[PDB]
Amino acid sequence: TIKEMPQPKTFGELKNLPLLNTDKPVQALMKIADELGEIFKFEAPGRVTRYLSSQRLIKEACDESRFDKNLSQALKFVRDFAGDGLFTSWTHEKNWKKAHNILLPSFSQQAMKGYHAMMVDIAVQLVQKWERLNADEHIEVPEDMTRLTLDTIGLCGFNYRFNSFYRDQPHPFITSMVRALDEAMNKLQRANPDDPAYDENKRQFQEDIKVMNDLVDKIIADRKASEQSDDLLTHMLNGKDPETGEPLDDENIRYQIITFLIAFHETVSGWLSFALYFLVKNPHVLQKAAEEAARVLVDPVPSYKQVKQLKYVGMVLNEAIRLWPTAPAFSLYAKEDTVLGGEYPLEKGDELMVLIPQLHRDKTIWGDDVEEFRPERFENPSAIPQHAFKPFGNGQRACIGQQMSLHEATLVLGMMLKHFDFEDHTNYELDIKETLTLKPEGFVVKAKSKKIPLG
């Protein structure tokens, strides 16, 4: 019964690393996961990990009493600019639970109602832009979603205006940020991080982190000066942890600000972008959501309440995040010696990787019709098996911004359906850009304005 784990082709001292020397590792680890089955060992020079694909094994791994969140090599590299912020801290380090407890109030429903106003502001801007296009013009969707999410998190979280829609070239902050995430990704695969090809990358990497820290330090200045503010940021400053009494040190604040900017803008852009893809490729589904939009959004601008009505829109969004979870994987380590799924013994500290895309393609759980996009799977969510659908991580370390995001996409996705008809004028073949997050690349549409006015 105590069976040895499969391992793909191994090279010399560099182990399995060349297998993942692509610009699309997750898509590659998938095409490897499909080849080796539910679990395989993947060694890199000096590190060892196990990648999981079946719900059967994942149900075992989501026991928080046996496994705790581990920092993947990937996260260890983002920690180079996100430090011990909520995403990249150990759940036992001091600053995790401190910051988790001071900030959690800011994301429950009760707090969401406060954000709803500024969310609509940024969305009206997106719709205003799509209305103001000339006839043969097009929409670059991932780019405009990027404008949207960064403008949305920065305003709700920090009362700071990026004014992305007032720009053609991405906000320079986004250019540096994306290249920093790209660098963390590439450093994973470096067959020799020494030899000179990578010296300018060292230059660029530090130069880009400085870029991010400057505007962060400008957000902190903008507040030391500008107010009745119910913020992520006010809870970060004035907020005190109720157990040891103190507030966050400045350094951890800086890591939290960057953390919040990045995670929201990257996962939420990818989500909406994917959502449009699957909608434009399945038009009756688009039709079905396109009437939920018209039916519920009966005032010129949506109210917080109206967003929770949009049941199918939530269903669409869920089925999209199921197929391509923009945060495709999270990592766990064994709290102590154990046997996983009764077959595989592991010493304490062994690391696990959940390939959320591959879990979400499990036939025993989701059926034989997985890769087809049918939002109707998410209609009795209680019918959905436990630990089968984990796009938002797991346990106490699950995504704190889940509801904020679900609220964000649904509102934005809802208004898009209300005000426009969308044409896949290019017959776009799906191209997934991979930083550490996922999102469609070069995705373009044409949008016919339904000519409904705004407020």
Q: Work out how close the CB of 68 gets to a second copy at its nearest, in angstroms, rounded to a whole number.
A: 9
399 among known catalytic residues: yes
Binding to ligand FDE (CB under 6 A) within 92-121 occurs at 100
- Fill in the amino acid letter for 287: Q
267 among known catalytic residues: yes
Tokens of 363: 């036939």
Between CA 399 and CA 60 the distance in angstroms is 20
Select 78 or 127, whichever has its Cβ closest to ligand FDE: 78
Give CA torsion, residues 72, 76, 81, 85, to 10 deg: 70
Q: Residue 87's binding partner, choosing from ligand FDE, a second copy, none, with beta-carbon cut-off 5 to 8 A by kind?
A: ligand FDE
Question: If binding is defined by CB under 8 A, does position 18 make contact with a second copy?
Answer: yes
Would you say 282 and 289 are in contact if contact means Cβ atoms under 8 Å apart? no
Segment interacting with a second copy (CB under 8 A) among 86-94, 296-304, 339-347, 398-406: 86-94
Select 2 or 135, whichever has its Cβ closest to a second copy: 135
Would you say 439 and 141 are in contact if contact means Cβ atoms under 8 Å apart? no
- Catalytic pick from 49, 146, 259, 267? 267
Name which position in 94, 113, 138, 305 contacts a second copy (CB under 8 A).
Answer: 94
Question: If binding is defined by CB under 8 A, does position 371 make contact with a second copy?
Answer: no
Binding to a second copy (CB under 8 A) within 156-175 occurs at 160-161, 163, 165-169
b (16+ CB within 10 A) / e for 330-361: bbbbbeeebebbeebebeeebbbbbbbbbbbb
Which one, of 442, 381, 433, lies nearest residue 406 by Cα?
Answer: 381
Q: Residue 244's binding partner, choosing from ligand FDE, a second copy, none, with beta-carbon cut-off 5 to 8 A by kind?
A: a second copy
Would you say 71 and 63 are in contact if contact means Cβ atoms under 8 Å apart? no
Between CA 79 and CA 69 the distance in angstroms is 15
Beta bridge partners of 339: 345
Q: Residue 160's binding partner, choosing from a second copy, ligand FDE, none, with beta-carbon cut-off 5 to 8 A by kind?
A: a second copy
Would you say 256 and 85 are in contact if contact means Cβ atoms under 8 Å apart? yes
Q: Residue 271's binding partner, choosing from a second copy, ligand FDE, none, with beta-carbon cut-off 5 to 8 A by kind?
A: ligand FDE
Does 399 count as an annotated binding residue? yes
From residue 170 to residue 189, what is the string marking binding to ligand FDE with x (rule CB under 6 A)? --------------------
From residue 403 to residue 422, what is the string marking binding to ligand FDE with x (rule CB under 6 A)? --x-----------------
Question: If binding is defined by CB under 6 A, does position 149 make contact with ligand FDE?
Answer: no
CA atoms within 13 A on the CB side of 435: 26
- Catalytic pick from 107, 278, 399, 420? 399
Would you say 27 and 324 are in contact if contact means Cβ atoms under 8 Å apart? no
Question: If binding is defined by CB under 6 A, does position 154 make contact with ligand FDE?
Answer: no
Question: What number of residues does the chain have?
Answer: 455
Q: Work out how close the CB of 452 gets to ligand FDE at its nearest, in angstroms, rounded to a whole number.
A: 28
- Fill in the amino acid letter for 448: K
- Fill in the amino acid letter for 455: G
- Close Cβ partners of 15 (under 8 Å, ≥ 6 residues apart): 43, 44, 45
Binding to a second copy (CB under 8 A) within 48-77 occurs at 70
- Close Cβ partners of 82 (under 8 Å, ≥ 6 residues apart): 88, 255, 258, 259, 262
Between CA 305 and CA 97 the distance in angstroms is 32
Question: If binding is defined by CB under 6 A, does position 87 make contact with ligand FDE?
Answer: yes
Question: If binding is defined by CB under 6 A, does position 393 make contact with ligand FDE?
Answer: yes
Select 206 or 396, whichever has its Cβ closest to ligand FDE: 396
Q: Residue 129's binding partner, choosing from a second copy, ligand FDE, none, with beta-carbon cut-off 5 to 8 A by kind?
A: a second copy
Tokens of 385: 């098996």
392 among known catalytic residues: yes
Select 180 or 400, whichever has its Cβ closest to ligand FDE: 400
Tokens 């945060």, located at residue: 327
Which positions touch ligand FDE (CB under 6 A)?
A: 69, 86-87, 100, 259-260, 263-264, 267-268, 271, 326-327, 330-331, 391-393, 397, 399-401, 405
Binding site for a second copy (CB under 8 A): 11, 18-23, 28, 70, 90, 92-94, 129, 132-136, 160-161, 163, 165-169, 189, 191-192, 195-197, 218, 221-222, 225-226, 243-244, 246, 249-250, 333, 349, 431
Give the catalytic positions in this structure: 267, 392, 399
